[PDB]
Each structure stands twice: as structure tokens, then as C-alpha cells.
Design a protein around this ligand. Sequence first.
Ligand SMILES: Nc1ncnc2c1ncn2[C@@H]1O[C@H](COP(=O)(O)OP(=O)(O)O)[C@@H](O)[C@H]1O
Ligand SMILES: Nc1ncnc2c1ncn2[C@@H]1O[C@H](COP(=O)(O)OP(=O)(O)O)[C@@H](O)[C@H]1O
Ligand SMILES: [Ca+2]
Ligand SMILES: [Ca+2]
Ligand SMILES: [Ca+2]
Ligand SMILES: [Ca+2]
Ligand SMILES: [Ca+2]
Ligand SMILES: [Ca+2]
Ligand SMILES: [Ca+2]
Ligand SMILES: [Ca+2]
Ligand SMILES: [Ca+2]
Lengths: 221, 371, 371
Amino acid sequence: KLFLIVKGELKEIKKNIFSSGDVYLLDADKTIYVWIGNKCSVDEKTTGAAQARTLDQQRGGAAKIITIDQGFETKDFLKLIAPKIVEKNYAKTLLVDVSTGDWAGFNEWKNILYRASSEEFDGINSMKMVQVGFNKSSLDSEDCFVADLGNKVYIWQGKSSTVKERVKAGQWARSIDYDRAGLQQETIFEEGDDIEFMAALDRGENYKESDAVQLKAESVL
Amino acid sequence: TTALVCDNGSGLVKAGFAGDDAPRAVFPSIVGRPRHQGVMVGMGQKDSYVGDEAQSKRGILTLKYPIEHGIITNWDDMEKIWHHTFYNELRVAPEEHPTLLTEAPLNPKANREKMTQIMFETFNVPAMYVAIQAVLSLYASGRTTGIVLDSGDGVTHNVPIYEGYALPHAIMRLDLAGRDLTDYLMKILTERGYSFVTTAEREIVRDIKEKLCYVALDFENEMATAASSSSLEKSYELPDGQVITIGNERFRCPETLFQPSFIGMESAGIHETTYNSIMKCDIDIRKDLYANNVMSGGTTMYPGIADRMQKEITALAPSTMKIKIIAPPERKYSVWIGGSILASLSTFQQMWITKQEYDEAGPSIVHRKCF
Amino acid sequence: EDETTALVCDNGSGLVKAGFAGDDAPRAVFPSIVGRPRHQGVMVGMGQKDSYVGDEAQSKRGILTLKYPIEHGIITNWDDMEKIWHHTFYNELRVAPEEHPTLLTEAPLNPKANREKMTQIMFETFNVPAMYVAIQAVLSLYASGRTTGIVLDSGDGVTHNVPIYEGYALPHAIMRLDLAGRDLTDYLMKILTERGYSFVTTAEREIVRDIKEKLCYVALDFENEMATAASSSSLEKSYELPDGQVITIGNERFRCPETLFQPSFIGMESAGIHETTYNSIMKCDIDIRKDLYANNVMSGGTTMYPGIADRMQKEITALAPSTMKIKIIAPPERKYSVWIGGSILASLSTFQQMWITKQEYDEAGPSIVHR
Ligand SMILES: Nc1ncnc2c1ncn2[C@@H]1O[C@H](COP(=O)(O)OP(=O)(O)O)[C@@H](O)[C@H]1O
Ligand SMILES: Nc1ncnc2c1ncn2[C@@H]1O[C@H](COP(=O)(O)OP(=O)(O)O)[C@@H](O)[C@H]1O
Ligand SMILES: [Ca+2]
Ligand SMILES: [Ca+2]
Ligand SMILES: [Ca+2]
Ligand SMILES: [Ca+2]
Ligand SMILES: [Ca+2]
Ligand SMILES: [Ca+2]
Ligand SMILES: [Ca+2]
Ligand SMILES: [Ca+2]
Ligand SMILES: [Ca+2]
């Protein structure tokens, strides 16, 4: 018996057209072969090694499981397929490729920019903060702004704002820190020496730093 | 519904959802308590801190490792950690998500039973499974039989597995790993003039390790090359615009893995422990183990460590052995990856331990489950 | 049908700043002074009154012995303070305090007994429904938009450095200097006397306060500015008295506030505000000093001279290491920053759970104020 590996299940093939971005489980009664393409993904690798253990468990436990990396086939094995047939293509992956960082909201993070203005409401408690566009073009000086960067939180205080506006900006930035695990340090920029603040808008909304070596969950195609 | 995976590592917790290709939440498995007690009154601090916030507030807190050396030893702190993972890091209610935990090799039955008890009675998880870290790493490599070298933050293990089962007579534990390496890099840097006293400066050293250090192929020649030339030096810029030059430290630090004598340990290097474990296995399977040697953990990430391990191992093994060392690029978190894959699989769902079964047979049901 | 409005009262060393919560400014500002007759011969007829407060006391000196209850930010005479508060509530604000929660402000390092006495008086003599005591510099920092920084509060009779981390003052690192606006007025008065002019009557002292608040400034480099004022007329400026007479003042304009940096000018053996700011920062944990240098907020009436921020940055940069980021914050509303912060604090909806109710006072006595 021969099966390509798809998601977690086994799709039966009887044509021995071996591919390089996948994994195939070959069934011989007392020895189970699993062949891992040189260009497949982890899920395809590990589903093979899992399925083989379920099969040997069903079989009372007397079968031997032979893992074999591509290009390294043993004669014992190759003499079951052939009276070199290795293609280049794949069967898909089941993982969802995420990128990650210091906070779990990472791979979907867009940096946010909010505005706070007391001109529209009376009292602090009535005030609200409104998302504006993540761009220098959205900065007025009559009011204050807060940039949620995930890693960090920047505050920009306009010279022509009021105490109430800066108090809301602080409140909101400390709230962001509170509601998101790990520490998100608050940095206040006064209008005038605001180089790094504008520099962050210049890094755009889709800018996030992570270190943490990123990896890709699919064959190379 | 979507299942949860949590690798309770010795120094970092890696948690995330089943199906993702990486742990979404990674944070230090550390809990700090005020050290002068008068700061929970007048300066208004909370009773305990977790992870990043605790380490930041090092200095007014005593930090303790619930899972120092891989085995959980404080269930109050472990509860704080897990609560943080579910509610603060992942932002989910664990009663709606099955939870796969990982355990260190040579974990006591009582330890795993208490883990089980705590998950069900304190977090109301619908179902849970506990797996062995090295086994998830092995499966992730694409293999079911091999020997894993798992080097993490506070403890390092050699683990041999045949057809999916660990061999506890031959499982090897060594109390040297990344954290001792960071400490040693700090010591030998301070022996050149550089000083790291602020909390920031102490985290800088962990960064230098992870970014600049590498494993020398032959320690003698590499030490000589650094002594006679400057080809091997490399520079690291501190925050404050001052720059640091680091030279032989880059490879003296990780060499401790092979020469524990560097930090005053009387013990064996990772190559030797791999050898002693393999020889302590069934005589018929040693060939298969030599040919399938998987490396997992954060401390197996130094460049050129695969080469050095093969060298020292082939020098140890018989002349006629076909030796191969497996270091997949995803090995830092292979454990977690395994859980994520395994929990998503269709064959696995039959193995999930439900709350009903816990109610029926007590906490010992967890022993009666295969991978 | 409506809700209730709260009172804010900053009991300053030289001025009382009182008003309503929500307003952008204190409705009432008056001298923190209590005057009592020269000798009993005066109050016979009644005739005269037992005592006078604030502006009227200033208006009636010579028959009154004048006293400052809060001479140094710490209240030292509770009868005179009661007269002050009474005047605040009934005369200036025109409210019945049984109808308004009352937030008072206190100096840094206020003795607990002192604050308990403040509490007893408010509840037992004014039947306040609720009261809260806040620390002046903390309200000042809050008004700057911050919960962590180091405040320099220079007022009428006392100056403080107060470092604050996460909203709590660090009393070990609090620095006091018993020099402030009034000592500067007195000194300016003397140095003008040394130019021909003669100020000695009380009305002439009010004129001197005006000259100070209108013409004085903080030299960035005192040696150079003295030289410029001595070799030309660039720095001279003319001030018209009420009778239409003009006078001309030159180096006086910056020798007066120079006292803040060189207390020796008024015969004080002490260190200027730059030095004490530094000494305070040094008394804090090494981990926060970076933040304190980055958030250095100025509050009080005597931080209003122009160019005091530039000078402060210079002198602190000379004191601190070369690689520190120093930032001096001088909010434009700092003359009333304390009060405004209080106003905002009492406005807050989150705040109300913290008001100390009369019920809690009757039940638990005055030490509840510490909570
Ligand atoms: N590129 C790298 N080189 C060397 N060490 C690294 C690298 N990346 C991470 N580490 C280290 O790996 C260790 C953590 O390994 P980990 O898988 O978390 O083990 P555990 O989960 O048992 O604590 C840390 O000491 C960290 O510094
Ligand atoms: N623009 C100014 N320039 C110089 N001094 C000023 C200015 N405005 C106010 N002052 C001084 O501020 C002092 C009072 O400061 P304040 O914070 O009100 O002190 P307190 O809390 O001690 O009452 C007065 O001495 C006044 O002369
Ligand atoms: Ca078997
Ligand atoms: Ca594929
Ligand atoms: Ca505005
Ligand atoms: Ca506006
Ligand atoms: Ca946080
Ligand atoms: Ca990825
Ligand atoms: Ca681990
Ligand atoms: Ca004041
Ligand atoms: Ca008045």
C-alpha cells in the first residue's frame, strides 16, 4: 500500500510518482516506511511519524518504523518501489503561517493612531478617543495624539492643547499598557522635539519589530 | 472549537493555538514577590508579578523559577503563570479550549497528576493531554525513532525513543543550559572591563549571546586565531551609543556545553552525554539512534553546533557507524510545534482526556494514554 | 434633579488656590495670611474684629500682626488655618461646605499627624460630605500628563524636589529648600534699593512683586549675561510706577531669580535647585533615574521666569553623565498646575470610589485618610 499525506489523513496512491514537497507513507506489514520530501513542510513530516505510530499500535506492536529522508533511500526500501522517480510539486499544508513577537496579537498587528480633543465634549469622563489615519497628515496642534505600536506607546502633545487633552492621552496610553500583557512603555513627545514620533508615522502602520526568527509553513513552490 | 498548546519550559513559557506554525505567546516562566513587603502598602504594588513585568521590576522583587530545571516545584506560582497564559497572554477562557501541556522527561507521576488536577479543578478545561517535550520534538523532525538533544533555559536532556516510547533507564539530565551560559558570558565579559549592572545592561548580555555567539569547531585552533588576529572579533552597539568589542567570548561561552569545567561543573559535555545515553540503550537499536540524532531547544541554535556535535560524536562512536545530526531550522520551538500539529490531527482526538473521564476514574487516568 | 459638584483647595505656602472641580482655574486666589490686632486697645469698641484673612489683612497691616499659618508648606497653626479655610469656603467661594466633597492638597513629607488634623478639622468643623488629600507635586505631574517623573515645585515660601514612580512619591529622595518666590521678591527689593530706588513700604513691595513677575528672567549663563548687561544697554528695561514715573532696571532682572541657583545671594548656605534636583534623582533606585531625567516637570509660581528651563537643562547636563537624555518640562499652566490637576482629579468618574465619606470617618476616625 502507498499513501500520500494530505492534512492529517492518507490519500491512497498506486502510481509511485514521488514528489519532493510532500511526505508518503508506504505500508509493508512488518515495516512501515515514511518518506519525507526535501522541500515539504513540518506538518507533512510530523503527520507521517504520527500515522506510523498509530499503525504500529494497531498492529499489536511488532512492526518496525523506518524513517527515511529523501535522497538517502536504503536499498531495502528502494527495491519495493522500483523494478529514480522523484517529481517536483506538492500537496498542500494545514498550518496557518503566523509571525510572532512579544505580544500575542502580533502577526495581525496594525499600529494605531488615536486623537483626543476636549473641544467636542464637556468633562473628562465624557471625552472619547477616535482613531485617525496613521500618518503625519492626521496631526493637528490644537489637541493630542497617541500611537499604539504594540511594542511601545508614543504620546504627542500639541503646543496648542489643554491639560484635559494631555490627561486623556496619558489615561489612554496607560490603559493600553494595562490591557495588554507584558510592559508597553509610554513615551511622551512634546511638539517640537518630536523627531522619533514623526519617524514612527514614517515607518507606516504595517511596521512591527520582532527579532524572533520567522519561518514559513509551506513548501517553497 | 480551537485547542490550546502550552509548553511549560524551564525558563520560558511557550503557548499558542493548535494549528498555528509558531507559539503566539512567549514569556519568561518566572514569578517575583516584593522583597521588602513595605512596598505593597505605601508604594501600592500587587502581591506577585509574572514574566516580563516581574523581570522589569527585578530589584524590588525576589524572582523564583517555578520550573527551574524542568520539573514544577511550586504550584502557587505555576498557577499564577498558567492563569496569566490563559487569561492575560492568550485572552481566552480555558473552559472552552482543550489544553495540551508538556512535561519534562523523568517527570514524577504525582507531579503530572497534580498538573492534571489543577487544570481541571482550577481552570475547568474541557479536555487535556500531557506530552513529553522531546517526543513532540522527535515527531516534528519527521521521525518516530531517534535520540533527541533538548537544551533549553535551565536544564538539558538526552532522550532516546524507539517507535514513539522513551527509554527511562537511559534518559540523561544535565543541569547546564542557556541560563548558565548567559551567566558565564556575563562573567567573562566583566573580566574585560565591561560592566552590566542596570536591569537593561543585564538583559543586553542575553542579547549578545543570541546574536553574536557561535560554536567553535576546534577550540584550540579558534582560540589561537583570536589570539593572533582580530579576524574573529565582532561589535555590538549598546543603547547609549557606546560600542563593545567581543572576541573569543563568542565561542568560549557555548563551549561550556562541551566543557562544563568552564563554570566549575564536574560533569560531561553534551557530546559525551549523547554517547553515554546511546550506549545505555538496547544494543540492536544504537545504529538507528546514531543515524537519527535530533536537536531541539533554544540552546541548540548557535551556528556551527551541528558540526561540532557530529565531530565529537564520531570521535566517540565505532569507526563503521553512519552518523547524522538533525538540526531543523524550526528546532527552537519544535516541542511547541509538535503539540500544535498533534492537537490538530484527526487520529489524536481519540486520546484527549475529557472531564467526564477525570470525574469517573480520578487523576490517574492521565497515565493510561498513549501518544 | 442633578448630581453634586466638588471643591478643590490648594493650601499654598503663600497663596490659597480654591475653586470648583471641572473649572480650568481657581475662582479664588488670596494670600495665605492671618492678621490679628496690634494690642487689645483696638478691639474694645468692636470696634475691630478678632482677626483678618488674606487680602484684607494685607490691607490692614501696622494695626495687625501678620502671620503665615503654612509658612513652609507644612501647617503650623490650626486656629489661623481654620480662619483661612473659613474665609475660603464662605467669603471667597460662597458655598456651604456641608454640600461639597473637598479635595485638599498637602506638601511633600507632610507629617501623618498633621494630615490627620487636617482631616479632623474638615469633617468636625465643616461637616464636609467627603474629603481627599493629595500631594501637591503629584497633582502637578498628573497635569503634565504623567504618573512618573520628578517635579520641581517652587512656590511662595518653599521649594521641593519630589520624585514620583507610578503615582507614588518617594519620600527618601524628597528634597526641600526653604527659598522661593517671596525670598526673591525681598532680594529684588534690596538690589533695587542699591540702585537709588528705595522700596520699604508694603505698597512698594507689591510694586516690586510686579516688577519681578513682569521683568525678571533666568540667565542661561550668568557670567556672560552680567558682562553683556555691564558693557551695553541691551538688557535694560523700563517699568512705569503707578504715579507715571518710569525707572530702569538692568542686571537686577536676572540677578533676582539667579538666587534659585545660587542661594548664597540671600545668605543661605545651601545648594541651588539644579544641584538638589540632581541629589534627589541620585537618591532613587538606579533603575528609574533614566526615567526621572527624561521626565523632569516644573510646577509652581516661581518656575515661571522665562528661560529657566534652558538653564535647568544646562546645569543638570553638567551634573549628570554625558550619555543621559535630560528633558525639562515647563507646562504653560504651571503657575496653577497643582490646582488644575486636582480639578481634573475630582472631576474623574473613576475617582469617586476614593472620596472619604463622613460615614467612614465617624466609624473609623481620622487615620482612614492614609488610605
Ligand atoms: N540564537 C540563539 N542562540 C543561543 N541561544 C538562544 C538563541 N535563541 C534563544 N536562545 C536561548 O535559549 C534558551 C531557551 O530555550 P527554550 O526552548 O525556551 O528552553 P526551555 O523552554 O526549557 O526554557 C534561552 O536561554 C535563550 O537565550
Ligand atoms: N510670572 C511670574 N514670575 C515670577 N514669579 C511669579 C510669577 N507668577 C507668580 N509668581 C510667584 O509665584 C509665587 C507663588 O507660587 P505658588 O505655586 O502660587 O506658591 P504656593 O503654592 O507657595 O502658594 C508668588 O511669590 C509670585 O510672586
Ligand atoms: Ca513495534
Ligand atoms: Ca507540501
Ligand atoms: Ca483642543
Ligand atoms: Ca482640535
Ligand atoms: Ca502591560
Ligand atoms: Ca511563521
Ligand atoms: Ca523546552
Ligand atoms: Ca504649591
Ligand atoms: Ca483676591
